[PDB]
Design an enzyme around this catalytic site. Structure first.
Site, PDB file in Angstrom:
ATOM      1  N   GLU A  12       0.836  -1.175   0.000  1.00 38.80           N
ATOM      2  CA  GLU A  12       0.000   0.000   0.000  1.00 38.80           C
ATOM      3  C   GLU A  12       0.883   1.241   0.000  1.00 38.80           C
ATOM      4  O   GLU A  12       1.873   1.330   0.727  1.00 38.80           O
ATOM      5  CB  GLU A  12      -0.899   0.038   1.239  1.00 38.80           C
ATOM      6  CG  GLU A  12      -1.956   1.133   1.166  1.00 38.80           C
ATOM      7  CD  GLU A  12      -2.842   1.193   2.403  1.00 38.80           C
ATOM      8  OE1 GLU A  12      -2.998   0.155   3.081  1.00 38.80           O
ATOM      9  OE2 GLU A  12      -3.398   2.279   2.685  1.00 38.80           O
ATOM     10  N   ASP A  63      -3.019  -1.997   4.735  1.00 41.63           N
ATOM     11  CA  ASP A  63      -3.652  -1.765   6.033  1.00 41.63           C
ATOM     12  C   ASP A  63      -4.936  -2.591   6.134  1.00 41.63           C
ATOM     13  O   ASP A  63      -5.596  -2.849   5.128  1.00 41.63           O
ATOM     14  CB  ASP A  63      -3.990  -0.280   6.193  1.00 41.63           C
ATOM     15  CG  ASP A  63      -2.757   0.581   6.378  1.00 41.63           C
ATOM     16  OD1 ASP A  63      -2.829   1.796   6.091  1.00 41.63           O
ATOM     17  OD2 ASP A  63      -1.715   0.042   6.809  1.00 41.63           O
ATOM     18  N   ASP A  65      -7.715  -1.698   7.172  1.00 37.05           N
ATOM     19  CA  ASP A  65      -8.894  -0.841   7.046  1.00 37.05           C
ATOM     20  C   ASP A  65      -9.479  -0.843   5.624  1.00 37.05           C
ATOM     21  O   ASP A  65      -8.909  -1.437   4.704  1.00 37.05           O
ATOM     22  CB  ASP A  65      -8.555   0.590   7.470  1.00 37.05           C
ATOM     23  CG  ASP A  65      -7.601   1.273   6.512  1.00 37.05           C
ATOM     24  OD1 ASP A  65      -7.358   2.487   6.676  1.00 37.05           O
ATOM     25  OD2 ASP A  65      -7.099   0.602   5.588  1.00 37.05           O
ATOM     26  N   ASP A  67      -9.591   1.378   3.211  1.00 35.96           N
ATOM     27  CA  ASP A  67      -8.647   1.865   2.208  1.00 35.96           C
ATOM     28  C   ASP A  67      -7.666   0.760   1.796  1.00 35.96           C
ATOM     29  O   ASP A  67      -7.323   0.620   0.623  1.00 35.96           O
ATOM     30  CB  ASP A  67      -7.871   3.075   2.742  1.00 35.96           C
ATOM     31  CG  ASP A  67      -8.640   3.854   3.816  1.00 35.96           C
ATOM     32  OD1 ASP A  67      -9.744   3.419   4.219  1.00 35.96           O
ATOM     33  OD2 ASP A  67      -8.129   4.901   4.271  1.00 35.96           O
TER      34      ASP A  67
END
Length: 185
Positions: A12, A63, A65, A67
């Protein structure tokens, strides 16, 4: 660094290549995606040739999350739709970054990849005589960007400690459906 001894980490935004991916027809034209596809060396769709694969392992790191899920979702579908044998042949993995860092006072810090491991490491350390600050001794990571570069490598890239999960054909199919639902808006 020959293929067998090479790995490609897509992170990421044993030779270990690293490429970023900042988070269907336009996606293929994005330069970051093109670099990754090109680095793999197989070609796409009809042109796909497993013999030209440059990397024995392809590791996605993001991550936990939304995103982070999004890019891992987009990447898994590109692979499932245009480079499927990479998945079926077991070349694709997901890296589990640590969730906590235990800052022992006078010893090496330890990393936990789950709440249960956190509790076990804490108990084990305390019983061994290790000291820890009760207010700020345990850091809960919010994302990869909060990690120290060296610690990120030691916990997610070091082969003797990293926690990797093999992506199955079913997993990738699940990611592709997710990609479809979300695109349907």
């Amino acid at each position: 660094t020959d293929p067998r001894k090479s790995e490609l980490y897509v992170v990421e935004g044993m030779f270990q290549a690293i490429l970023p991916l900042r988070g269907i027809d336009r996606v293929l034209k994005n330069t970051e995606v093109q670099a990754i596809i090109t680095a793999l060396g197989t070609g796409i769709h009809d042109e796909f040739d497993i013999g030209k694969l440059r990397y024995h392992k392809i590791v996605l790191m993001a991550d936990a999350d939304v995103d982070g899920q999004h890019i891992s979702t987009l990447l898994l579908t590109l692979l499932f739709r245009f480079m499927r044998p990479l998945i079926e042949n077991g070349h694709v993995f997901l890296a589990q970054p640590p969730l906590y860092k235990l800052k022992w006072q006078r010893s090496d810090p330890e990393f936990a990849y789950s709440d249960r491991e956190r509790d076990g490491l804490l108990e084990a350390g305390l019983k061994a005589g290790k000291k820890i600050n009760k207010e700020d001794g345990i850091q809960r990571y919010k994302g990869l960007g909060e990690m120290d570069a060296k610690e990120l490598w030691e916990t997610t890239m070091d082969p003797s400690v990293r926690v990797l999960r093999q992506v199955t054909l079913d997993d990738a199919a699940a990611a592709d459906e997710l990609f479809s639902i979300l695109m349907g808006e």
